[model samples]
Target: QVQLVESGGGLVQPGGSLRLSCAASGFTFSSYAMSWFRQAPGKEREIVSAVSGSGGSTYYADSVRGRFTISRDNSKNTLYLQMNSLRAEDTAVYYCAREPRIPRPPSFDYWGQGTLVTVSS
Candidate 1:
């Protein structure tokens, strides 16, 4: 059994920055990669981006392109997302998950509960 737990969402003002956490357990962190997904108010979940296990290779969506910093700490078994310049629409529940491998099609088996970040004044 494997799982990812996310936290560190805080009330941030518009145009502010945010840093979130996604910690893993029950598996080897260095062996598998990490992916991020999130859904705003009524929008469906969409892929944000991802970083390799060793924080090597990475992937990102066009919408969020150049807007995120995805990194990881193998020893801590944790994934981190940092972004500046947020808007009210940026408020969403951010999810972190495990990637099966370095190949195509990220079939995430373990998903975090998702941390909700509120963007407001």
Candidate 2:
């Protein structure tokens, strides 16, 4: 089965910043559009943005500036997502998703294992 692994702590105290990543395996990262989504505990998910091998990307909902970024290392075939200036509200399960191409709808054709960020004392 395809798996995605995220590396980081389970908690980050307030006023602190955190960086978590999702590593893609069993698939070609460059061949698909890697995306990020946020789901508050017990709530529906919100699609953040999606990026392709050529560095082209699309964002949904509110515009996310430098606070969040999605990128990939084609040489290593790994996709990386980073969220800075984190706050308590940012605490949620950050997931890495994928689609056949740059344009995706209906649903994420594939998804990563998902990483959870819990902001606490």
Candidate 3:
């Protein structure tokens, strides 16, 4: 019964960056790989990026314009989504997902509630 809750969303302002985070509980954070997804204020959900279970080796989608990265604080049981090159297009709700090292089926196990990141001038 793992649970993930994301936070850190507000006005990012023009040309600035914001760091979003997700906290996990009920599971060993370092033993499972974590992934990120986002919805653009309600259009469609898209896969952003992911970090490894052992706490290294990040995998990002080509769809991401190199402005997005994923990292984690293993000791704190938290995952981070860092994005630069702020633009209105960056405004979206980021969702954090947890994946088992090996899934019986091919699917993510759990996901964070979602965090709204808005960019405004």
Candidate 4:
């Protein structure tokens, strides 16, 4: 089993996009789907998408898919999430996720370290 940890700075300016890397060293990269979730301090989690490396099937949630994109680099066994339009409302903790066995309610069993980006001047 492996875990994904988000990395980056604390703040990013408006009109600028952010890129996060989710490193998976021990887990099987192609066996399951890789996803991303967005959340503020006290709000509900929004799923960005689910990326399948094997078949390249992407299931992006509509709520946040317009501004978010999820991808994976199978060669490196790492997942990537990029958010554009860097707005003030986009300021939140971004995480990498994976679906766990047992058919949970779109729950991510594995999560990244979480990168918090504050959009401002």
Q: Write the residue-wise lDDT of candidate 2 on 1-121 in tens digits.
A: 5567766635777766666666777876677767778788888887777786555765543545667677777766676666666678777887777666546574656777677888877
User: Estimated TM-score per prediction?
Assistant: 0.88, 0.79, 0.88, 0.82
Best of the candidates, lDDT: 1
Pairs of residues at least 3 apart in sequence or in different chains that clash in candidate 1: none
Model 2 poorest 10 in a row by lDDT: 55-64
Off by over 4 Å in 3: 106-108
Error of 2 at 49 (Å): 2.7
Per-residue lDDT tens digits for candidate 1, residues 1-90, read 787889887799988889999879989889987889999887899889888777889998876677678889999988999877877877
**Overall local distance difference test of candidate 1:** 0.84
**Models sorted by lDDT, best on top:** 1, 3, 4, 2
lDDT of 3 by residue, 13-121 (tens): 8678888889999988898888898899559988889889877688888766588878999899999988887789878888998986685443656878888888997
lDDT of 1 at 38: 90
Global lDDT of model 3: 0.84
Q: Which ranges in model 1 have alpha carbons more than 4 Å from their true place?
A: 101-108
